[PDB]
Ligand binder design. Structure first.
Ligand SMILES: O=c1n(Cc2ccc(O)cc2)nc2c(Cc3ccccc3)nc(-c3ccc(O)cc3)cn12
Length: 309
């Protein structure tokens, strides 16, 4: 079987170099962050955070829907997209968080921020929110790291999968074969990407070896209490308890099709109060199959949050 191009998508395609020319760079700590900033309507800030395998490019067709109502800021996480590399070559959640929060300090942000998070980008938003509970206006999340995986909540073979990614076989899958870009990314998009769109995702990780480390380090942070990184399990424990009790924080959850990793996410998200639920037909990288539906859903949600404020 093979997937097929969307015949109407090529008309509006934005290549990597087209996107990267639209971005800015700012030095941050011992490195720098590449990011997109629509600048206008700076009274609010909507910060879009990608997760593993991707970059700010993931949001290119989503963000135009929100720009008319709020300043949109979209970083490439450290070591990803066109950003700088981490000073110590470490790419754990806390390394990403260190660069992200230092970048926030330089952005002239409003007091209360709106976050839109996918995958580990949602973990970063949730952790920031837990540590800055007075800085959060609303959180949109999707395919998110919502909670830990307790021993009794393990589903069949999650043990196998995490042992695989933490093994040397997993390291070679990523560092040598570029598993998350070459395999996972296209496998979790329903359409076939245009060659230029795939090239934009490949470009940061085109060379073999250690440059692909961020895409290996992210899954190894998974908060499986059985053998998971204790610091990340505690981080997720803390922000999950905060989210479960955050009755006054408006949230939007965008659901996609069920998957091997997906079922724990949706059940965890329904434990957070004040959550508006919506659905798009897509897989994990749902931005590539329903960007306009997503953008219109986020826009209505932001409009409702602001008007009701
Ligand atoms: O579906 C999937 N993806 C696709 C996917 C990846 C990330 C994401 O966010 C959503 C979807 N990837 C796997 C992997 C490899 C892997 C990836 C990331 C972390 C840990 C392991 N391994 C298994 C598996 C291996 C043995 C086994 O017995 C059962 C399952 C399934 N995978």
């Amino acid at each position: 079987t093979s997937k097929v191009y969307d015949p109407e998508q090529r008309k509006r395609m934005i290549t990597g170099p087209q996107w990267w020319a639209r971005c800015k760079q700012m030095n941050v700590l011992d490195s720098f962050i590449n990011y997109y900033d629509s600048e206008k309507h700076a009274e609010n800030a909507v910060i879009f955070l990608h997760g593993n395998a991707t970059s700010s490019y993931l949001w290119r067709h989503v963000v135009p829907h929100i720009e008319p109502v709020a300043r949109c800021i979209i970083p490439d996480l450290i070591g990803m997209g066109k950003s700088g590399k981490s000073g110590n070559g470490s790419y754990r959640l806390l390394d990403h968080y260190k660069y992200l929060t230092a970048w926030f300090e330089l952005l002239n942000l409003p007091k209360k921020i709106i976050f839109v998070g996918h995958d580990w980008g949602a973990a970063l938003a949730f952790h920031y929110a837990y540590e800055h509970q007075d800085r959060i206006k609303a959180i949109v999340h999707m395919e998110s790291v919502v909670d830990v995986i307790e021993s009794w909540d393990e589903w069949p073979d999650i043990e196998e999968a995490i042992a695989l990614i933490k093994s040397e076989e997993g390291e070679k899958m990523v560092l040598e074969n570029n598993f998350f870009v070459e395999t996972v990314l296209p496998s979790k998009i329903m359409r076939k990407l245009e060659p230029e769109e795939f090239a934009a995702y490949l470009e940061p990780f085109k060379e073999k070896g250690e440059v692909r480390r961020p895409t290996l380090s992210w899954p190894r942070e998974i908060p499986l209490v059985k053998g998971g990184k204790p610091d990340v399990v505690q981080i997720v424990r803390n922000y999950n308890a905060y989210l479960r009790a955050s009755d006054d924080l408006p949230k939007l959850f965008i659901e996609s099709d069920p998957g091997f990793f997906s079922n724990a996410i949706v059940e965890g998200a329904k434990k957070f109060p004040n959550t508006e639920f919506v659905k798009v037909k897509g897989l994990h990288f749902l931005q590539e199959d329903a960007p306009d539906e997503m953008g219109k859903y986020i826009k209505s949600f932001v409009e409702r949050v602001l008007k009701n404020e």
